[PDB]
């Protein structure tokens, strides 16, 4: 039994070993309680404002759209403390862990942004943090690994399986199965077993709420579409949530097309995978014809989650949101364009969302449209990657 619906249509659920169910039920109950607690809401709002820097700006990009009938705004999650939207939800989950009397945090991370965010939230809130990271990811993210250690977190390399994000995801679950009494598993995206998709969306929903108030203030109307990259689905569902009931607002999720969908080397399970059951949920997955889970490929390390949040699969199924893909080269071109024309270095993740907005604009330049791209993070971290590619 649960207090909230674990499914979005056919997607979602709680596909975890029996031993983990009490942890999920405990978390769901604490969450429902926290959401009705004005004190919890005030403490969360306070950290978001005074520690993380909310609200984040909504920046109009006139130089990029000059000569077309597209008006483009960027929701500036790149200006959030930590440099990405991940910070919002780790602060809420950290407060939930404390609400449950937990003193420890367990987290998984691929590119390391979630590890960094979990570590910073744990440092601020006095939680003892341990992070699982696939050894291949550890190897290629030494900067993020060192930040986690400076912040007091223990980083544990995972060598099992492919030694990447999904393997770290399995190890986090394994750990929690036996330590949930004193540790909270701080899941990094709007995926996994209920109640995580729900919790993560609610702790990222201020992105869309602010965007709505900011766009109404600046344009006196809602956007024609809000566009966000989709790795696991948290920044996108955070931007989409408050607009779901505004039927006129398009919700466009952008998955990584990698070297191109036809190459098979991509990270677009929602539109090009097959529904499966893994990581505690039923959702579209990157998997072999046999049912073995595979990695997502993208020039962007952070769009590496091999599945997608169940609410996105659901919004897609009913036609409420549309999902598309953007290739590595398209994302790189958008990264370059934003740097040169607006002086903003976007994360390569976010660059996928920008790349799709640029296509909407460039393909029909005389189409009048008000677009908001969720700039989920800053791209300082991608400078070396982009440099080498350009050097190549």
């Amino acid at each position: 039994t649960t207090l909230l619906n674990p499914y979005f249509g056919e997607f979602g659920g709680m596909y975890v070993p029996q031993i983990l169910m009490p942890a999920l039920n405990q978390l769901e109950e604490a969450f429902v309680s926290a959401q009705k607690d004005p004190e919890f809401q005030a403490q969360f709002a306070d950290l978001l404002k005074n520690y993380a820097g909310r609200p984040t700006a909504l920046t109009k990009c006139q130089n990029i759209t000059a000569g077309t009938r597209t008006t483009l705004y960027l929701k500036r999650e790149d200006l959030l403390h930590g440099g990405a939207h991940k910070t919002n939800q780790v602060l809420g989950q950290a407060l939930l862990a404390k609400r449950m009397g937990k003193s420890e945090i367990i987290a998984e991370t691929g590119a390391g942004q979630h590890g960094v965010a979990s570590a910073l939230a744990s440092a601020l809130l006095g939680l003892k943090c341990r992070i699982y990271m696939g050894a291949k990811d550890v190897e290629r993210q030494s900067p993020n690994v060192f930040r986690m250690r400076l912040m007091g977190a223990e980083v544990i390399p995972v060598h099992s399986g492919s030694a990447t994000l999904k393997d770290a995801c399995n190890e986090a679950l394994r750990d929690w199965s036996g330590s949930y009494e004193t540790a909270h598993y701080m899941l990094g995206t709007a995926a996994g077993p209920h109640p995580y998709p729900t919790i993560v969306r609610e702790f990222q929903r201020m992105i869309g709420e602010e965007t709505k108030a900011q766009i109404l203030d600046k344009e006196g109307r809602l956007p024609d579409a809000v566009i966000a990259c989709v790795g696991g689905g948290s920044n996108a569902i955070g931007m989409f949530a408050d607009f779901i009931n505004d039927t006129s607002v398009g919700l466009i999720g952008v998955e990584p097309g990698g070297h191109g969908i036809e190459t098979g080397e991509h990270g677009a399970p929602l539109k090009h995978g097959r529904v499966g059951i893994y990581f505690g949920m039923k959702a579209p997955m990157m998997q072999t014809a046999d049912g073995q889970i595979e990695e997502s490929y993208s020039i962007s390390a952070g769009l590496d989650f091999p599945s997608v949040g169940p609410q996105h699969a659901y919004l897609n199924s009913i036609g409420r949101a549309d999902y598309v893909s953007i290739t590595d080269d398209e994302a790189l071109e958008a990264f370059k364009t934003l740097c040169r024309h607006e002086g903003i270095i976007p994360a390569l993740e976010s660059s996928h969302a920008l790349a799709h907005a640029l296509k909407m604009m460039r393909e029909q330049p005389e189409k009048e449209q008000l677009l908001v791209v969720n700039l989920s993070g800053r791209g300082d971290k991608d400078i070396f990657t982009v440099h080498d590619i350009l050097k190549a």
Binding site: I19, R174, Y278, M285
Partner: protein
């Protein structure tokens, strides 16, 4: 078929516990794995619990995680596992055979098709490690329609509602994960016979499980470690597996 029912009736007539080893199919290769399984049976295994290698065995400890990797290194696929299962059943008609599965491999090409394939090759039960009772409906329904026993784990804590669900939903045997109260309550609710599992690695643990009221004990990591330890010597591997299983099974006898 009623292989588990028949087994437990026979064991009860002999005031004997069941000793059930677990191995990963195809670890360290198909041929060696088939020899390992025949050795476990000849050595006294009463039933078998067999894992199909899966990419993300999030309910498995390091030892089994490594067995999955060895099987994958050998190219083992679920299809090959089902080929092995038919060969195993063809050689051993009465031993109960239970699969330890991950949900995706069951759901992949259709839940009902999966249990139909299990029935076709002669498997007796399926324990889907990542399907709690709350999500088990389609799985147990399909299992029951194909004469497959759906196995459920009764966790260490397990409140009363859970014990009642596990007793109602499962068949064949109840997997008792890591005591007397859990066992008495399972019996009270007419659950399938309990097989105790989780770290069983010595004969005294098998005798203690039987003394506690369990119908037997499952041992996997302890078995898989022997495979891991003797990879360079298949003959020594089989000799050590025989010795260990023989000892563990002896401990289950009255």
């Amino acid at each position: 078929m009623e292989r588990y029912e028949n087994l437990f009736a026979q064991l009860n007539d002999r005031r004997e516990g069941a000793f059930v080893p677990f191995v990963t199919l195809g670890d360290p290769g198909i041929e060696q794995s088939l020899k390992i399984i025949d050795t476990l049976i000849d050595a006294g295994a009463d039933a078998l619990e067999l894992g199909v290698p899966f990419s993300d065995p999030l309910a498995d400890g390091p030892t089994i995680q490594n067995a999955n990797l060895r099987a994958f290194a050998a190219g083992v696929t679920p299809a090959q596992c089902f080929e092995m299962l038919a060969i195993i059943r063809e050689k051993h008609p009465t031993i109960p055979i239970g699969l330890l599965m991950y949900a995706n491999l069951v759901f992949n090409n259709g839940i009902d098709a999966f249990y139909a394939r299990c029935e076709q090759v002669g498997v007796d039960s399926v324990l889907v490690a990542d399907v709690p009772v709350e999500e088990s409906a389609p799985f147990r329904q399909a299992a029951l329609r194909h004469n497959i026993a759906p196995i459920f784990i009764c966790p260490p804590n397990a409140d009363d509602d859970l014990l009642r669900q596990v007793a109602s939903y499962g068949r064949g045997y109840t997997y008792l994960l890591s005591l007397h109260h859990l066992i008495e309550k399972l019996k009270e609710y007419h659950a399938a016979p309990a097989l105790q599992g989780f770290g069983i690695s010595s004969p005294e643990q098998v005798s203690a499980a039987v003394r506690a009221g369990a119908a037997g004990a499952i041992s996997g990591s302890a078995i898989v470690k022997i495979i891991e330890k003797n990879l360079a010597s298949p003959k020594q591997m089989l000799a050590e597996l025989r010795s260990f299983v023989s000892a563990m099974k002896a401990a289950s006898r009255a």
